[PDB]
Design a protein around this ligand. Structure first.
Ligand code: HEM
Ligand code: HEM
Lengths: 79, 101, 60, 379, 435, 51
C-alpha cells in the first residue's frame, strides 16, 4: 500500500539537515518564541475570542436574570 | 465592482495561505477531478506546486510564517490549475450526461 | 409436461427475491405446523401426566 | 537475511501501523488526542478491571462494595477516582478529537469518520451504564430518566423500555444488565478502534493545511512516538491533578447517598459530558421530538461530510468558517452550561435558542458561508 | 436513398431445385467476377468414433486429383484461369468454392462437379495426405484459441457427435483407409444434402442449366449440452485462454436475433483497440482500464438444434478471476437491468455486422450456401432488419434470462489457469442474490 | 444528485422496482414472523390458531 518507497513524485528538492547532537534543542527559545506566540495570538484572537465573549455575556445575563426571578416581587403584596 | 474587488482582496489577505507562499490552487482539496488535473499538469508547474506545498508544510510544522515581502501578492496570483480542472470537470460532465441517456 | 419440481423452480426458485419469500412464508407455516405436531407427540406420550390433562379435576 | 521488523507478520502489522507509518510532518498537537483516546481506553480497561475484582452488581451490595473499594481496598480510592475522572478525560479528548475532525476537514475520510461516530455512540453508552453502576441516588435517577426517554418511541416504546429494564422500572435486574454491558462494551470499542486505524491507514493522516502531504512525510516512530509520549504525559498530569487534588470536582455529591426509589434528589442531571444533549432534549416540549433531536445531535456528524461545500478542505484558510466553528463551540459550551442549570425562565429560552443555533450553524450557515468563500476566491 | 430503400433494393436470391434434390441458388450483382461453390451438409457431427476424421481427410485430398483430371492437372487448370479454389469443413458443413471471372463460370462449375462426384483417392496420395494431416494436428496444437474451443466443444457436448473435433484423433487419422473415405463420400456427398450457390456476375438460368448438365449424374440426434469444465493446466504458457459458454438456440430459433444483440452489447476488446477506456461496452472499458485482458470476444456458435453462447478471453495469470467476474456481471446485467440506449447501440452494431459481412462475392456465396443448409432459405437483409427492429430492452432481458440467468455453463481453460475460479464459484456467479 | 436524474435511471428503477418490492415483502413477512406481531397474524388463516 502506501509506503515510503512510493508515495509521490518529487524532483529537484534539496533538504539540508543537522544531527541532533550537533544542534541545540532550544535555540533562541524565548527571544523567538515570544514574538512568534504574540504573532499567532494576534492572528487568531479576532477569530476565537468574540464567540466566547458573547457566551460570557449571555452567561452573566442569564445568571442575573435567574437570581432576579428567584427574588421576591413587592407588588404581589400591596394589599 | 470596485467594492467587490476590495472585499476579494481583503479575504485573500485574511485567508493566510499567501503568508505561506502558497497560491490559491495549492489549497484546493484533492478530489478525483483535482487529482486528474494535477496529473495533467506540465512538469514545471507540477514541480513548482510540489515545492510550494512542501515549503508550506515545513513552515506550518515550525508554526512560522514567510517574510512579509515573500507573501504571494493577490494581483500576481496565477490560477495555473484552473484550466486543467475545468477541462477535467467538463469531461466528467459529458460522461455523466451520456450515462443519463 | 413440466414436473412439480420444474414448476417450483420456474415460479418461486428462479428469482432469489421470490426464493426468499417462499422461505419466509414457509417458515411461518412450518413453525405452527411443526410445533402443533411436536406438542401432540409429547402430550400423547405423556397422556394423563401433565397439568393440562389433570387440571379439569382441580380447576373450578 | 531479512529484517524481522519488516518480515514477521505481527511485526509487519506493528511496523506498518506505528513504526514506519508515513506521517505528515506538520500535524499539530491536536493530532495527539487520538492516541490519547487510546491511552484513556487502555486505562479505562485496566482501572476498570481492578474495580471489577471488588464490585458486586447487586442492589444490596453495589454501594457497599464501592465504599469497600474506596475505604478498604489498598489504593482502592486511587483506582476508583482514576476511573471516574478518566471517563471525563476520555470525553474531553473525544470532544476535542471531533472538533479537530470538523475544523480540519478530517471527515472527508468517510469510513474513518463513520467508524468514529460509531465509537462515539459506543463510548457514550458505556459511560452511561458505568455511571449507573455505583447505584447512588444520581446513578439510579439518571438511569431512570435516560431509559424512560425510550418510552417516547411510538408503539414499541413501553415494551422496549421494559425489556431493557428487565422489569417494570430500574431495579436489580437493570443494574446487573448494565454491569455486564459496561464490562463487555469497551472490548467492542477496542475492536472498532482497530478497524478505525485500519481505515485511517488506507489514506494516511490529514494535516492542518488540509493539503496532501505526501511530499513531506516522516517516519511515525522517532518523531511522533516521543510526541505522543509527551502528550500522554501532559494528559496524565491533568488527570492526576483531578484525581489527587479535586477527585469530586466533576462528580455530584448527591451520588454519595444510597439509591432511594421513593425520593428524588433535589436536582436530576446527567454527567457533564451528556449535558449538552440533555439540554437539546429539554428544548423540545414533545417527548418524541426531544428524543429525535437528541439522536440527531450526534447523527449530524454523519451528514457533516456531505455538507462540505468549500473547495478547500481545512478551515485554516477560511476565516469566516473559523468564526462559524468557534460560534458552534461556544454554543456547545452554552448547551452544557444550561443542561447543568434548572428548567426555569431564562434557561429554557436560552436553551431553545442554543439548540436552534447549533442545528442552524451545522446545517445552514456553514455550507452557505463556504459557498460565499468560494465565490470570494473566484472558484 | 435511405437505409430502408437500400435494403429493399438488394438483389434477391433465386433458388431452384434439380430433379435429384440439388438446390441451385444464385445472387446476380453485375460484376466481372463471381464466386461459385458447393456447400455440403456433411461434417464432423455426422461421423462416429470409427471415422471421426473422414470429412477432414476427404477435404484434404479433394483437389489432389480426380478421375478426369489426374494429379496436379486440375490445379493447373484453375491456376490457368486465374481462379482461386478454396475449401473448408466445420463441425456441421463442408464447402468447396471457386472465385473466378464470370466468363469462367461454366468451367468452374464443371470443376466443382468433378471435385464433388468423381474424386479419385489414390493410395499414395492418401498416405501423403495422412502424413500432412498428422503434421497439421501437431501444428494445430500451437493455436491456443482453436485448442480452447475444441475443449469447449468436447466438454459441452460430451457423449455426442458434436464433442468430436473436425480433424479427429491422430489414431483415427492413421487408421482411416480408402474404403472408409469412399464410404463417407458415398453416404454424405449426396444431391439432396448439397447446395450449389453462386454470387456476382452469374445468371441464374446459366448456373441452373450448368448444374443440370454436370450435377444431374448424381445420387438421388439432438445433442445434449452438459455443464462441465476442462482445465488443461500448463504454467509454461505465457497467457491463459478461457472459453465459457451456455446452451444456445438452434439456427431456426428466432431468439438468435436478440441474443446476438445482447452479445453486441457485451462487445469485444483487444489490446490493439484504439477505443481504450472510452469503449461503450462496460466490460471492454474495464478491460482496457485495468489491463485485465489482452483480447476477449463474445460468440454465438449455432448448430442445427443447439449452440454455444458465451465468451472467450486471453488473460494474464493474475487476472483471470477478475475478468470472469466482470464478464459474468455483464451477463447478469443483461438478464436483470438492460436499458434502451445500449440495446439500440447493440442493434446498430448487429445491423452493421450483417451488412458488412455480405460485402464481396465470396461472402455472399457463403451466406447463400450456409443459409440454404441451415434455414432452408436465404433470409433477405430486410427480414433481418425487421427482426432486429422487433428487439427492445424487454426482449433482451427476457431472452438473456431464458438463456443465461441461473444456467450451468461449460468452461474450457488452458495455460496458467490456477486463478480460474472453481466451477462451483462460476455457477454461483451465473446468478445474482440481489435479483 | 442530478447525475441520476436521467431517462436511463428511470428505466433502471422500473427494472428493479418489482425486485425491491419482493424483498420488501420478505422483510415484512420476516418481521411479522420473527416478532409474532399478531396484529397481522390474526388475519392469517392457519397461523391465527396460535394465540
Ligand atoms: C471506555 C471505557 C469505559 C468508560 C467510559 C467507563 C465509564 C465509567 C464511569 C463514568 C463510571 C462511574 C464511576 C463513578 O461514578 O464512581 C464507571 C464505573 C465502573 N466501571 Fe466503567 N468505564 C469504562 C470501562 C470499564 C471496564 C473495561 C470495566 C471492567 C472491566 C469497567 C468497570 C466499571 C466498574 C466496576 C464500575 C463501578 C465501580 C465504581 O463506580 O467505582 N469500566 N465506568
Ligand atoms: C474510542 C474512540 C476513538 C479512538 C480510540 C480513536 C483513535 C484514533 C487515532 C489513534 C487516530 C490517529 C491520530 C489522529 O489522527 O489524531 C484517529 C484519527 C481520526 N479519528 Fe479517531 N478515535 C476515536 C474516536 C473518534 C471519533 C468520535 C471520531 C469522529 C466523530 C473520529 C474520527 C477520526 C478521524 C477523522 C481521524 C483522522 C484525523 C486526520 O487524519 O486528520 N475518531 N482516531
Amino acid at each position: 500500500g502506501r509506503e515510503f518507497g512510493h508515495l509521490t513524485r518529487m524532483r529537484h528538492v534539496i533538504t539540508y539537515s543537522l544531527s541532533p547532537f550537533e544542534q541545540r534543542a532550544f535555540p533562541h527559545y524565548f527571544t523567538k518564541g515570544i514574538p512568534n506566540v504574540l504573532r499567532r495570538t494576534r492572528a487568531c484572537i479576532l477569530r476565537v475570542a468574540p464567540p466566547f465573549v458573547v457566551f460570557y455575556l449571555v452567561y452573566t445575563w442569564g445568571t442575573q436574570e435567574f437570581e432576579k426571578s428567584k427574588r421576591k416581587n413587592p407588588a404581589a403584596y400591596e394589599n | 465592482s470596485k467594492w467587490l474587488e476590495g472585499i476579494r482582496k481583503w479575504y485573500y489577505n485574511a485567508a493566510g495561505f499567501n503568508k505561506l507562499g502558497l497560491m490559491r490552487d495549492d489549497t484546493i482539496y484533492e478530489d478525483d477531478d483535482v487529482k486528474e488535473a494535477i496529473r495533467r499538469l506540465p512538469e514545471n508547474l507540477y514541480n513548482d506546486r510540489v515545492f510550494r506545498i512542501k515549503r508550506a508544510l515545513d513552515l506550518t510544522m515550525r508554526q512560522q510564517i514567510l517574510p512579509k515581502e515573500q507573501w504571494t501578492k493577490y494581483e500576481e496570483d496565477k490560477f495555473y490549475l484552473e484550466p486543467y480542472l475545468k477541462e477535467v470537470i467538463r469531461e466528467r460532465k459529458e460522461r455523466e450526461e451520456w450515462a443519463k441517456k | 409436461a413440466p414436473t412439480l419440481t420444474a414448476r417450483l423452480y420456474s415460479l418461486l426458485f428462479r428469482r432469489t427475491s421470490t426464493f426468499a419469500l417462499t422461505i419466509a412464508v414457509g417458515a411461518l407455516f412450518f413453525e405452527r405446523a411443526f410445533d402443533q405436531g411436536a406438542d401432540a407427540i409429547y402430550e400423547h406420550i405423556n397422556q394423563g401426566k401433565l397439568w393440562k390433562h389433570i387440571k379439569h379435576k382441580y380447576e373450578n | 537475511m531479512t529484517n524481522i521488523r519488516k518480515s514477521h507478520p505481527l511485526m509487519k502489522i506493528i511496523n506498518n501501523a506505528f513504526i514506519d507509518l508515513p506521517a505528515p510532518s506538520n500535524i499539530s498537537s491536536w493530532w495527539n488526542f487520538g492516541s490519547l483516546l487510546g491511552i484513556c481506553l487502555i486505562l479505562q480497561i485496566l482501572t476498570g478491571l481492578f474495580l471489577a475484582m471488588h464490585y458486586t452488581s447487586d442492589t444490596t451490595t453495589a454501594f457497599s462494595s464501592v465504599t469497600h473499594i474506596c475505604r478498604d481496598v489498598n489504593y482502592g480510592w486511587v483506582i476508583r477516582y482514576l476511573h471516574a475522572n478518566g471517563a471525563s478525560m476520555f470525553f474531553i479528548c473525544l470532544f476535542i478529537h471531533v472538533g479537530r475532525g470538523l475544523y480540519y476537514g478530517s471527515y472527508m475520510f468517510l469510513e474513518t469518520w463513520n467508524i468514529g461516530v460509531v465509537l462515539l455512540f459506543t463510548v457514550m453508552a458505556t459511560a452511561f451504564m458505568g455511571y449507573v453502576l455505583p447505584w447512588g441516588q444520581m446513578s439510579f435517577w439518571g438511569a431512570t430518566v435516560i431509559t424512560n426517554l425510550l418510552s417516547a418511541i411510538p408503539y414499541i416504546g413501553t415494551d422496549l423500555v421494559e425489556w431493557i429494564w428487565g422489569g417494570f422500572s430500574v431495579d436489580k435486574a437493570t443494574l446487573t444488565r448494565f454491569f455486564a454491558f459496561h464490562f463487555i462494551l469497551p472490548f467492542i470499542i477496542t475492536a472498532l478502534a482497530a478497524v478505525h486505524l485500519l481505515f485511517l491507514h488506507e489514506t494516511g493522516s490529514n494535516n492542518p493545511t488540509g493539503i496532501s502531504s505526501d511530499m513531506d512525510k516522516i517516519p511515525f516512530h522517532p518523531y511522533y512516538t516521543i510526541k505522543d509520549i509527551l502528550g500522554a504525559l501532559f494528559m496524565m498530569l491533568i488527570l492526576l491533578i483531578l484525581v489527587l487534588f479535586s477527585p469530586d470536582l466533576l462528580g455530584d455529591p448527591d451520588n454519595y447517598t444510597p439509591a432511594n426509589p421513593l425520593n428524588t434528589p433535589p436536582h436530576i442531571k446527567p454527567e457533564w459530558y451528556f449535558l449538552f444533549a440533555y439540554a437539546i432534549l429539554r428544548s423540545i416540549p414533545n417527548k418524541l421530538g426531544g428524543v429525535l433531536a437528541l439522536v440527531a445531535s450526534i447523527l449530524i456528524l454523519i451528514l457533516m461530510p456531505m455538507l462540505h461545500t468549500s473547495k478547500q478542505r481545512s478551515m485554516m484558510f477560511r476565516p469566516l468558517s473559523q468564526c462559524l466553528f468557534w460560534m458552534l463551540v461556544a454554543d456547545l459550551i452554552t448547551l452544557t452550561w444550561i443542561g447543568g442549570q434548572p428548567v426555569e425562565h431564562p434557561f429554557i429560552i436560552i436553551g431553545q435558542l442554543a439548540s436552534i443555533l447549533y442545528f442552524l450553524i451545522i446545517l445552514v450557515l456553514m455550507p452557505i458561508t463556504s459557498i460565499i468563500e468560494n465565490n470570494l476566491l473566484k472558484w | 436513398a435511405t437505409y430502408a430503400q437500400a435494403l429493399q433494393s438488394v438483389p434477391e436470391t433465386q433458388v431452384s431445385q434439380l430433379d435429384n434434390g440439388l438446390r441451385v441458388a444464385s445472387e446476380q450483382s453485375s460484376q466481372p467476377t463471381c464466386t461459385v461453390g458447393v456447400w455440403i451438409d456433411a461434417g464432423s457431427r455426422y461421423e462416429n468414433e470409427k471415422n471421426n476424421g473422414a470429412g477432414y481427410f476427404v477435404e484434404h485430398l479433394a483437389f489432389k486429383g480426380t478421375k478426369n483430371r489426374p494429379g496436379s492437372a486440375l490445379e493447373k487448370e484453375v491456376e490457368s484461369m486465374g481462379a482461386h479454389l478454396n475449401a473448408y469443413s466445420t463441425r456441421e458443413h463442408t464447402a468447396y468454392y471457386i472465385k473466378a471471372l464470370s466468363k469462367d463460370l461454366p468451367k468452374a462449375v464443371e470443376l466443382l462437379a468433378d471435385i464433388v462426384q468423381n474424386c479419385s483417392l489414390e493410395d499414395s496420395q492418401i498416405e501423403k495426405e495422412r502424413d500432412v494431416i498428422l503434421q497439421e494436428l501437431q501444428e494445430n496444437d500451437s493455436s491456443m484459441r482453436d485448442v480452447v474451443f475444441d475443449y469447449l466443444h468436447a466438454t459441452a457436448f460430451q457423449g455426442t457427435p458434436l464433442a468430436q473435433s473436425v480433424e479427429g484423433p491422430s489414431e483415427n487419422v492413421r487408421k482411416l483407409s480408402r474404403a472408409d473415405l469412399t464410404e463417407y463420400v458415398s453416404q454424405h456427398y449426396k444431391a439432396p444434402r448439397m447446395v450449389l450457390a453462386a454470387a456476382g456476375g452469374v445468371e441464374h438460368r446459366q448456373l441452373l442449366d450448368l448444374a443440370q448438365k454436370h450435377f444431374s449424374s448424381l445420387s438421388g440426434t439432438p445433442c445434449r449440452f452438459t455443464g462441465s469444465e476442462i482445465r488443461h493446466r500448463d504454467d509454461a504458457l505465457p497467457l491463459a485462454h478461457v472459453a465459457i459458454a451456455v446452451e444456445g438456440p438452434g439456427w431456426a430459433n428466432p431468439d438468435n436475433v436478440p441474443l446476438q444483440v445482447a452479445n453486441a452489447i457485451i462487445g469485444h476488446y483487444d489490446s490493439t483497440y484504439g477505443g481504450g477506456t472510452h469503449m461503450s461496452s462496460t466490460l471492454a472499458s474495464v478491460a482496457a482500464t485495468r489491463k485485465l485482458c489482452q483480447s476477449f470476444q463474445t460468440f454465438n456458435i449455432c448448430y442445427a438444434e443447439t449452440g454455444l453462447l458465451g465468451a472467450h478471453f486471453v488473460c494474464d495469470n493474475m487476472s483471470i478471476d477478475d475478468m470472469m467476474f466482470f464478464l459474468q456481471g455483464q451477463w447478469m446485467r443483461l438478464c436483470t437491468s438492460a436499458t434502451e440506449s445500449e440495446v439500440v447501440r447493440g442493434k446498430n452494431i448487429l445491423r452493421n455486422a450483417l451488412v458488412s459481412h455480405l460485402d464481396g462475392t465470396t461472402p455472399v456465396c457463403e451466406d447463400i450456401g450456409r443459409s440454404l443448409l441451415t434455414y432452408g432459405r436465404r433470409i433477405p437483409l430486410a427480414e433481418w432488419e425487421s427482426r432486429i427492429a422487433e428487439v427492445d430492452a424487454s426482449v433482451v432481458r427476457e431472452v438473456c434470462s431464458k438463456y443465461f440467468y441461473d444456467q450451468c455453463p461449460a468452461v474450457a481453460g488452458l495455460g496458467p489457469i490456477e486463478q480460474l475460479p472453481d466451477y462451483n464459484r462460476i455457477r454461483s456467479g451465473m446468478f445474482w442474490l440481489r435479483f | 444528485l442530478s447525475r441520476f436524474l436521467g431517462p436511463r435511471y428511470r428505466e433502471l428503477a422500473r427494472n428493479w422496482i418489482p425486485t425491491a418490492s419482493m424483498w420488501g415483502a420478505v422483510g415484512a413477512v420476516g418481521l411479522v414472523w420473527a416478532t409474532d406481531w399478531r396484529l397481522i397474524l390474526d388475519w392469517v388463516p392457519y397461523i391465527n390458531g396460535k394465540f
